[PDB]
Structures are given as structure tokens and as C-alpha cells.
Amino acid sequence: PIRNYLYWEPHCYDIPMCWSMRSIFESIDGINTMSDDFQELVPEMRRM
């Protein structure tokens, strides 16, 4: 819920560590997407 607050917060990036925490969570989301990318790349190597 705090993460949702960070995403919704307009002044998240200015004063507090809200920006740091929100960007950490964005990196977590990107790491999940990177895992999805690995799961997509495995069939490519299988076909090769």
C-alpha cells in the first residue's frame, strides 16, 4: 500500500525518500519483466 502511495504521489520525487523507494519498486517490476524476457528467450535457444 505504501508502494501504491509512492506511485500515486505527485510530490514523490521532490522532498522525501519516496522517489528512492518508488524507483526501487520500479526496478523490482523491471526485474520481473526481465525474468519474463528470459522465459521468452529460452524457446528461442531451444529452436536454435
Binding site: M17, M34, D37, M48
Partner: protein, 49 residues
């Protein structure tokens, strides 16, 4: 017989080309996502900078 073998080789080469193109596109998307991650992390820690 050699003509048949060469035709099969050409088909396999076409399939390899398709595979390579798919791999390149997916790696481009992965690099875009990783660039987003790096931009977030670099923009992060400013409180702790």
C-alpha cells in the same frame, strides 16, 4: 540427391534467419526494460546519495 540436400539446407537457413530476427527483437525489448531499471535505480538513492 545433391539438389534435394541443398534445397533442405536453404529452408533451414530461412528458419535460422527467422529465429535470429525474433531473438534480436526480444533482446531489444529486454534491453529497453533493463534501461528502465537502470534509470530508476540511478534516479533512486538520491535520499541516500
Amino acid at each position: 540427391t545433391s539438389i534435394d540436400s541443398m534445397t533442405e539446407m536453404m529452408n533451414i537457413q530461412t528458419e535460422l534467419a527467422a529465429v535470429s530476427q525474433s531473438m534480436a527483437d526480444k533482446m531489444a525489448q529486454t534491453s529497453d526494460d533493463t534501461a528502465d531499471v537502470r534509470d530508476h535505480l540511478a534516479d533512486f538513492d538520491d535520499f541516500f546519495r
